[PDB]
């Protein structure tokens, strides 16, 4: 029943979502170059904020524990950038 709540994608929104996902993937590569941080770490912090404060945990593979404190520091180091970055 829960699965039937989410409508099936049209060929357009199928390509749109798949497209936005691939662009976001590249936006974290180009974002680790600028910031000079770990790609994986960045992409996790991007997840922390989209999913919500319900999930927050130490992702084994990453080097810095993911407590609300260190995500806020990386969310500010992100917001600290010029409009073009």
């Amino acid at each position: 029943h829960e699965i039937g709540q989410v409508p099936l994608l049209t060929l357009e929104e199928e390509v749109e979502l798949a497209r936005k996902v691939e662009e976001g993937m590249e936006a974290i590569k180009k974002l680790s170059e600028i910031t000079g941080l770990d790609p994986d770490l960045i992409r996790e912090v991007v997840r922390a904020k989209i999913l919500g404060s319900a999930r927050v945990r130490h992702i084994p593979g990453l080097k810095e524990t993911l407590d609300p404190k260190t995500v806020e520091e990386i969310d500010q180091k992100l917001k600290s950038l010029p409009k073009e970055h």
Partner: protein, 157 residues
């Protein structure tokens, strides 16, 4: 649909007594009223380049392929020529029949009037929009908002 903004200069000859004087003409505004049919005649030699808008048309004579005259036919002007036609000087191009006025999708910036006997030759600084439609497909995405003024070479899709 991209409403492309064109801004050129064009002319038109009317009976001086049928022409209402104004330093500009907003869309739909009356430009002249003729008590009888008056044949807007050609004043240059060349091959016609008809360009019909929504209402009202353009008409560009050329020698070789260099433009030599650009005429403007407002509403009320039925063109008596076809595209690519050869016109000798003085041959009637269109016909005005009573009230003629600017089309809705085009306006007159400046207006310059030279008088010559019982007529006026208007040099209208016209600016209008010519829409072109583009079909968009499922593999493609529109990267431009509604009302976004684009310059040449910009990406829309």
């Amino acid at each position: 649909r991209v409403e492309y903004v064109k801004k050129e200069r064009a002319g038109l000859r009317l009976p001086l007594a049928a022409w209402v004087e104004k330093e500009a003409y907003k869309p739909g505004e009356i430009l002249a009223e003729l008590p009888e049919p008056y044949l807007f005649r050609a004043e240059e030699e060349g091959v016609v380049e008809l360009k019909e808008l929504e209402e009202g048309a353009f008409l560009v004579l050329r020698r070789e392929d260099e433009p030599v005259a650009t005429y403007f036919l407002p509403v009320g002007m039925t063109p008596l020529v076809v595209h690519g036609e050869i016109v000798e000087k003085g041959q009637p191009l269109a016909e005005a029949k009573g009230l003629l006025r600017m089309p809705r999708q085009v306006r007159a910036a400046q207006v310059e009037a030279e008088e010559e006997g019982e007529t006026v030759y208007l040099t209208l600084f016209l600016e209008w929009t010519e829409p072109k439609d583009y079909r968009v497909q499922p593999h493609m995405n529109v990267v431009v908002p509604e009302g976004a003024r684009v310059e040449a070479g910009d990406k829309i899709v």
